[PDB]
Design goal:
Elements (H helix, E strand, L loop, with lengths): L36 H4 L2 E3 L9 E3 L22 E3 L16 H5 L7 H21 L39 H12 L115 E2 L21 E3 L11 E2 L26 E3 L11 E4 L6 E5 L25 E3 L5 E4 L5
PDB class: virus like particle
Keywords: polyvalent staphylococcal bactoriophage, Myoviridae, tail sheath, tail contraction, virus like particle
Assembly: monomeric
Amino acid sequence: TGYGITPDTQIDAGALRREILDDQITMLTWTNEDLIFYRDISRRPAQSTVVKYDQYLRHGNVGHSRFVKEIGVAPVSDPNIRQKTVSMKYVSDTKNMSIASGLVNNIADPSQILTEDAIAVVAKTIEWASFYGDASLTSEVEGEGLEFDGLAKLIDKNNVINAKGNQLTEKHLNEAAVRIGKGFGTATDAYMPIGVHADFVNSILGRQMQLMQDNSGNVNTGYSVNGFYSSRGFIKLHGSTVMENELILDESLQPLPNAPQPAKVTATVETKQKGAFENEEDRAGLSYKVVVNSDDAQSAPSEEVTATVSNVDDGVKLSINVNAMYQQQPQFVSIYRQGKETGMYFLIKRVPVKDAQEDGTIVFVDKNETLPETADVFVGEMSPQVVHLFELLPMMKLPLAQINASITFAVLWYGALALRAPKKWARIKNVRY
């Protein structure tokens, strides 16, 4: 009031006559441009039913048999198997504008800030849909609304485990490049996260020292590493800055979301008291922290291996984390994710396994793998004949019908990601950040 002002909290019950100011928004987040794997994947349409056919070769029999005197035996050529892969439908849109707050005075808003929020949220859910989730066998056998994953199905012989999270020693990349060698192809790219492509620089390499006749003072230091080449020359387009699963919001940011429509918090996983049979050393005991119930159609337990087990490479496997799932229908729970321990050290959770759901009673999960560090980096050949993204209908927006004098709103399809060469690509696990 009166004379003298500031800092004064502008309630006019706390204040005087003076006129506050305001600005243009400044986005600190993942942007749209900052997505990469979704930017470079080549894309062709699948005009189809949600399925389609992919026709795929494996070759003849040569050996000591065929060995040439007069005639052969049975010139049976090939299997040529065929493999479908389904499309998937994943618009995620709850958009609203109160005709009140669309018509008042604004900041540049909203129906541009909304379309951005949409096209961004879906077109991120694409590449995240590419890097992790397979079709998790759901409440009962079928596909699911989840995109049959880009790199989960890949793993057959190409995942070179780093027995513990270690550096990228440039020997591993070489190994994944000869693995993709025997698959008749030459790995041209690499990806994810930016918490490796640094620690592949600041930890290991770039420590050549040039102590020369060299001027005092002004000179650079350090090293910036792209264009690695081993068997065959390539680039690492790398450092997405995106991980969703890897860092679980199961941290203190854990928030029940309307436990009405959020399936009931899982029974805090039955404590293993881990017994040592399955491949492992003799680990410690294991503890459990009651879960924080999660979004539409998923419940996620927490702990895995807690106290003493974590001295290097004991391969300590929490024996039975038995998740007792009891739910009143909200969305009958499907994926019950065991998101493993805080880390040996820096306490924020991680995500070892999304396990599709069957027992007939409590889910059973043995453990040790991948646990817990930021891990993957994905090397292989991106080229329209190898990693290929099927767009049933491109991203569109359709309006909807009004009831509450709000306005609903939507974006639309993407479809699925199909490999033509499930062996010509490679992913290595348990790197570090």
